[PDB]
Amino acid sequence: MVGLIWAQATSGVIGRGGDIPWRLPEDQAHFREITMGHTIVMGRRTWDSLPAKVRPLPGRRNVVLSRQADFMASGAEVVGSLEEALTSPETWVIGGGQVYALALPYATRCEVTEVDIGLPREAGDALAPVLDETWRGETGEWRFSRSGLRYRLYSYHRS
């Protein structure tokens, strides 16, 4: 089962200056809940951006996609193609924009957080993959986070 998991603003922005452009602890909790115990796949640039004490993500099999054959990813495996990244019983692709594009055609689930923040797309932004007409499932009710930022969860699926 190949899933994608991401958080986006309503406009589709998922990154600005290499950062998620909001603060949402409750989305961090949701991300852990969906991924824990499973394989996670990320691009090398995403791995390299993480603080040393936060990688590998604990409790999950970490897979890093790279074209650098000598890359050292302490506590993870490094694969040189997407095919080899998707052989576990359940895999969550966790970023970045490049790897989400690559994996989209293979995915049969998406777990999306939509953040109700009016960030128009700007030069340099990273953008979410586009969900086409093949997907179905639940668009959850809006909730206020503890700070007052509104968010809701999509749980979509397809054959």
Ligand X SMILES: Nc1ncnc2c1ncn2[C@@H]1O[C@H](COP(=O)(O)OP(=O)(O)O)[C@@H](O)[C@H]1OP(=O)(O)O
Ligand Y SMILES: COc1cc(Cc2cnc(N)nc2N)cc(OC)c1OC
Binding-site positions for NADP(+): 6-7, 14-19, 43-46, 65-68, 80, 94-99
Is residue 99 a contact point for ligand Y (CB under 6 A)? no
Is residue 128 a contact point for ligand Y (CB under 6 A)? no
Which of ligand X, ligand Y, none sits in contact with 99, Cβ below 5 to 8 A by type?
ligand X
Quote the least distance from Cβ 43 to ligand X, whole Å: 2
Residues 29, 22: Cα–Cα separation, whole Å: 15
Is residue 125 a contact point for ligand Y (CB under 6 A)? no
SS3 per residue for the chain: CEEEEEEEECCCEEEECCECCCCCHHHHHHHHHHHCCCEEEEEHHHHHHCCHHHCCCCCCEEEEECCCCCCCCCCCEEECCHHHHCCCCCEEECCCHHHHHHHHHHCCEEEEEEECCCCCCCCCCEECCCCCCCCEEEECCCEECCCCCEEEEEEEECC
Name which of 145 and 159 has its Cβ closer to ligand Y.
145
Torsions phi, psi of 53, nearest 5?
A: -85, 0
Find the binding residues for ligand Y in span 43-82 (CB under 6 A).
Answer: 46, 50, 54, 57
Quote the least distance from Cβ 27 to ligand Y, whole Å: 5
Is residue 103 a contact point for ligand Y (CB under 6 A)? no
Positions in the binding site for ligand Y (CB under 6 A): 5-7, 27-28, 30-31, 42, 46, 50, 54, 57, 94-95, 113
Positions in the binding site for ligand X (CB under 6 A): 42-46, 65-68, 71, 80-82, 95-99, 102
